[PDB]
Design a protein around this nucleic acid. Structure first.
Lengths: 205, 50, 262, 151
RNA sequence: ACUACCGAUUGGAUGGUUUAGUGAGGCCCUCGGAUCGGCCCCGCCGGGGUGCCCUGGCGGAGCGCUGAGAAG
RNA sequence: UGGUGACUCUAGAUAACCUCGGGCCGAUCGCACGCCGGCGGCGACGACCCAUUCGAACGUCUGCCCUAUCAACUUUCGAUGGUAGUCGCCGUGCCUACCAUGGUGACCACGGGUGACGGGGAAUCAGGGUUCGAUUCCGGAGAGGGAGCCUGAGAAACGGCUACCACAUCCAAGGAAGGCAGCAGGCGCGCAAAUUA
RNA sequence: AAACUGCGAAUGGCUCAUUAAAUCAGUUAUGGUUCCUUUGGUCGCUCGUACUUGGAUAACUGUGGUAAUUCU
């Protein structure tokens, strides 16, 4: 089958070398997992040593992290927007490692309002269901209101994350490798990485 | 053509040789496990489905 | 090959087993176990070639699977079970106890010991690691893992361990001035006190050992097994006390023994 | 920024660039913490690695390699590749029939970290063995000394 | 008469590098769904808490819900 | 906490995830039976993980015969390096995408040949050398030639399977089966080599 | 006896066609990986019908097909 041996290639001098043995099963390669967005369909593979690889063929849900504040949530993959390796994989919406994804932002906004009690990604009109005035504007005690005061003393996040919450969908990087794991975990983009990926995406157009 | 007929309620079975194409047209062009009333097989097979 | 090997040719066997050339084409091929293939004495060679209770391998099997032989207090019926350095062999039927320790020529001596000495053994500590929930473990030279050791016990130290239970009972540090026995290399079987350990980072350490007769020899750090604290060994030693005689004094001793008797 | 010259964002995997900090720390100084370590065999980690800004995953001091195995030397002969150089090791091979010697050489492609600047052709380089980093490179530059004739 | 060379016949066959094209068979993926079973519904019906429910065996249809699954 | 010469080591804490082609947390079997319905001693078989043993597999440095009537080769079809990934048990142009134009060579590359498997070793022997090593030990390779798989911890297995190529066995002509560079034995080849015990 | 289940059949034996920094030898590395088995450790560390669960399938019985097979 696919062989990932080093003896089929040329030498450092550029000369060709003759194989002294035929292809071995420890030199095998398997067809690539082009994981796409869709309802869950993964296939388990028996590999070297009787161990297990999980080959994800269709994934739609992972978990992703805010690392500035160390909070991760299980959320949904929405779309693929950038790939540093091949744009043909953006066109095919292929989930690989370090492909730039946009994901649903509802659990993160939920935790931010349940923790810091400030509105996030909200319009000027600010029409809220009464659960949101229950969460954002609860009735508290003296110690609790004080602790909330020093909690909102530093509860200011970047304007770019504000802009993405205004838009409604967060950018993230897939850090796991999904053809070997069956998972598409990752982390939410922030900081200089976020401005890098925004200017590269804008420079595509 | 021969027929190996089996009856599971008493677990008894028998081979019967039948050579008439008119009697076998009730079996032709159909698949395995397709239920057929074997009426044309004989006069004793009126209520027998196989 | 396409997989692991199951046969040992007799000329390719370890030389210290003292097998001959014409008995067969095969050697007994030790099982996997707590000792290396090249550093063990299999039970069939002990019961037949050395101790001579048996004349064939079939008689070895008949002895072993009547459940008479204990190795470190555990009954073994594998005839090729790899027994190695400091292992206690107990035959309760004949009332015999042995430790597998080396001659001055690098061969496992038939060393008979006292039944109270067969209660324990010594092990060289090969690794110290901390496992899950902060639990310290040591791994010895005979594949023993002990949880919760003394925090003072380090790698290259020697634990004195109780075969009835398997727990740490005493220990000896690696220090200059302690007694050691050489378990590999060209100085296999010699005994002496450690006088200098020189360190080579990224490489093998070299330990210098001085014999009780004043001879000095160096080995690697892998080949050193610390036996006793300072000068007195914590186990019984063979007839030679780790003193390697040269061929001249060995001939002289042989001639004096022939002259005295005969 | 002389750092982001690739199509993906270059960063050291061990350092975190998105810490949530106050305004006074923001106006204080905008310096990232840097990951570095010692190639510990009596080799000194250079200042250009500790205080530098480059990103090299194959650098001995700031990357993800370990130095274990052999330590050799060579003279720099070619420097036309990207973050790797080609050095030359000369030796004498003894032909024992004639009891004489012939001079032989081996070319060796080694990874040069960006923390070594002003590396010229003919300067003596000390390399240490690492894991395979490409098809033909296995050694990694650890020291540079200049040629004795050069001032 | 013998020995030894050249040789028109693209002579016929065969092989090794290659240009172009076809390509068995396995493996992977996307379909497919012959068959096989369960749940729901009903019929033949046994008991109780005293017709509400369920207990167990058989049969009936429902591309209703599904699970395994061969050829291709 | 503990370790190394050096960790992005080991251990700890937090936030979660945990795959339906699914990760552990025992519906298993024998022998002696005994204490206050409940408590039990030997074992056998399984078992995620950690260590060990037996390995294997990829790398480091140095080392090989003849040939210039082989002097430039590699590079579109990966050649040398970088960045991101894919695949892989893992390191890696192993492969893909985009870049840089690199890498080797009269210290003999590249090509070709060998009546070339490599060593331990053998003949000779003052010494240096010269010739031999298919062959019982060690390592490699192959099972007519190629290629591709399944199962399994482990094989690209051939006293396994699936094709094609070359041969070839039976047949009622529809079909079916094949692999002695295993032990014997036969034919062929030859100057050249044993018994179907 | 048979048959299901488990294990082994990847060892051994043969040959030297290939193969020229390849193989192999000495030396180092896995801090860059897998490992049935043996040996040791772990196996109430999880806060959420059990005094024992469900459907089959061989061997066996019985009827067969083909010139032919360790076919079924």
């Amino acid at each position: 089958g696919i062989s990932r041996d080093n003896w089929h290639k040329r030498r450092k001098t550029g000369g060709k070398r003759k194989p002294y043995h035929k292809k071995r099963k420890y030199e095998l390669g398997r067809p690539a997992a082009n994981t796409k967005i869709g309802p869950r369909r993964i296939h388990t593979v028996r590999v070297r040593g009787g161990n297990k690889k999980y080959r994800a063929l269709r994934l739609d849900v992972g978990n992703f992290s805010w690392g500035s504040e160390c909070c991760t949530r299980k959320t949904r993959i929405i779309d693929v927007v950038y790939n540093a390796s091949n744009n043909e994989l953006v066109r095919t919406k292929t989930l690989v490692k370090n492909c730039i994804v946009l994901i649903d932002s509802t659990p993160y906004r939920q935790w931010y309002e349940s923790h810091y009690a400030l509105p996030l990604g909200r319009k000027k009109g600010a029409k809220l269901t009464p659960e949101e005035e229950e969460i954002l504007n609860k009735k508290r005690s003296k110690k609790i209101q004080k602790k909330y005061d020093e909690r909102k003393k530093n509860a200011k996040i970047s304007s770019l994350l504000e802009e993405q919450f205004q838009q409604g969908k967060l950018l993230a990087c897939i850090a796991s490798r999904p053809g070997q794991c069956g998972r598409a975990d990752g982390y939410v983009l922030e900081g200089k990485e976020l401005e890098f990926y925004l200017r590269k995406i804008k420079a595509r157009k | 053509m021969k027929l190996n007929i089996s009856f599971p309620a008493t677990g008894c079975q028998k081979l019967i040789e039948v050579d008439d194409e008119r009697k076998l047209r009730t079996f032709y062009e159909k698949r395995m496990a397709t239920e057929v009333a074997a009426d044309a097989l004989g006069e004793e097979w009126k209520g027998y489905v196989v | 090959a396409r997989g692991p090997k199951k046969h040992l040719k007799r000329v390719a066997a370890p030389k210290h087993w003292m097998l001959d050339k014409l008995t067969g084409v095969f050697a007994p091929r030790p099982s996997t176990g707590p000792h290396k293939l090249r550093e063990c004495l299999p039970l069939i060679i002990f019961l037949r070639n050395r101790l001579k209770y048996a004349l064939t391998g079939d008689e070895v099997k008949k002895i072993c699977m009547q459940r008479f032989i204990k190795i470190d207090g555990k009954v073994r019926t594998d005839i090729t079970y790899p027994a190695g350095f400091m292992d206690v062999i107990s035959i309760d039927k004949t009332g015999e106890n042995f430790r597998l320790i080396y001659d001055t020529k690098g061969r496992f001596a038939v060393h008979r010991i006292t039944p109270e000495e067969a209660k324990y053994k010594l092990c060289k500590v090969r690794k110290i690691f901390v496992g899950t929930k902060g639990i310290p473990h040591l791994v010895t030279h005979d594949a023993r893992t002990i949880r919760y050791p003394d925090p003072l016990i380090k790698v290259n130290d020697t634990i004195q361990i109780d075969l009835e239970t398997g727990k740490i009972t005493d220990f000896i540090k690696f220090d200059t001035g302690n007694l050691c026995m050489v378990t590999g290399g060209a100085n296999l079987g010699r005994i002496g006190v450690i006088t200098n350990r020189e360190r080579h980072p990224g490489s093998f350490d070299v330990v210098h050992v001085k014999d009780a007769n004043g001879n000095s020899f160096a080995t690697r750090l892998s080949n050193i097994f610390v036996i006793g604290k300072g000068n007195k060994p914590w186990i019984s030693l063979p007839r030679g006390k780790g003193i390697r005689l040269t061929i001249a004094e060995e001939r002289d001793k042989r001639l004096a023994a022939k002259q005295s008797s005969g | 920024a002389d750092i982001q010259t690739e199509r993906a964002y270059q960063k050291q995997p061990t350092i975190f660039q998105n810490k949530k900090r106050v305004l006074l720390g923001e106006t204080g100084k905008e310096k990232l913490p840097r990951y570095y370590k010692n190639i510990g065999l009596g080799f000194k980690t250079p200042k250009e690695a500790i205080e530098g800004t480059y990103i090299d995953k194959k650098c001995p001091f700031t990357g993800n390699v370990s130095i274990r195995g052999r330590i050799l030397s060579g003279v720099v002969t070619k420097m036309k590749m990207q973050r790797t150089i080609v050095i030359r090791r000369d030796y004498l091979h003894y032909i024992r029939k004639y009891n004489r010697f012939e001079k032989r050489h081996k070319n060796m492609s080694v990874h040069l970290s960006p923390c070594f600047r002003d590396v010229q052709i003919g300067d003596i380089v000390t390399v240490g063995e690492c894991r395979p980093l490409s098809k033909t490179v296995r050694f990694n530059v650890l020291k540079v000394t200049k040629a004795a004739g050069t001032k």
